[PDB]
Amino acid sequence: NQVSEFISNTFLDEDVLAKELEDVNKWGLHVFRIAELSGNRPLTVIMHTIFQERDLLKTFKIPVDTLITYLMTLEDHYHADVAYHNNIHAADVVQSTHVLLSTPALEAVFTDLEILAAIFASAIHDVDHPGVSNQFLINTNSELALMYNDSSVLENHHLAVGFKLLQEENCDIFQNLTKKQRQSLRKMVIDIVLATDMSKHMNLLADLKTMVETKKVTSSGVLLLDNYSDRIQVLQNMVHCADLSNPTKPLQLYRQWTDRIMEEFFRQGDRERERGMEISPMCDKHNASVEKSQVGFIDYIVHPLWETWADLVHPDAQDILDTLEDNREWYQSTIPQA
């Protein structure tokens, strides 16, 4: 019910560190550990690793100094105090995108500019998040909502901040891209981050299902994507899967994310209570069925998405999907009884 209402109102329209960074290609990287070892700089060290690993600095003539400055600055603009939508969630999504990009079924499909674009999109997609929803911002007549006219209010903001930070001294990581390259990347990045607006979930999902229904493959079984709308769609869904990936992670990672999000939600609901507003679903700490809420979230949102993605990249996502089902199974066993 409040699970039903949440859903309907959200998804509808130096040595140790290096050893841990060796898991950069693995689903279920200990991102919270990397955060601790890096002095709360997971996004920087993770992003830097991915860029060396994918050879992106040579390809795009990005000086490492420029990459590191930009990343440190970007990471600075994620909020200290926000429990979920912080630099660790950013790092997490980036590295999840990284792994999904490297999937066999997608081998040699995307250009380096597209790879660069999905990884950058990931890195910036929640920057300067205040730890409250679009609907909160809309209902409280906030300056951000006025500015962007009630539409993808936060996702427009993240975009604007992430590109704005390029303009600082020695931060222009796209300096050696051509004008054509730069426009192409800018377009792709905007399309992706705006696709992270949760309210678009069902729209995205419908499209992904059509991509699977109309799937064409080479004789070696690799995905054939011959138009821009098809390839940007695949990257939107990929980055959206990365964003709804927490339930698909090893359970000790999953439980931390769940705790952190609930604490961000309760933090909002406190604000709603101080303002005399009706507290949003899943935001009332005095009345929140967490276990049940996760079984619903998986059943109606996460598994549908991931099951379709798994179809698209068959069988590259099977272990991911097996973890998700096991996780669902755990939370189910934990549902409190009278």
Ligand SMILES: O=c1c2cccnc2n(-c2cccc([N+](=O)[O-])c2)c(=O)n1Cc1ccncc1
């Ligand atoms: O990634 C997670 C998420 C990650 C871990 C745990 N739970 C999450 N939930 C969640 C939390 C409480 C209740 C429900 N529900 O469906 O009733 C879902 C979520 O909605 N998302 C996606 C999301 C993240 C941030 N804002 C809105 C939605």
Ligand SMILES: [Ca+2]
């Ligand atoms: Ca960990």
Ligand SMILES: [Mg+2]
């Ligand atoms: Mg977001």
Ligand SMILES: [Zn+2]
């Ligand atoms: Zn996010």
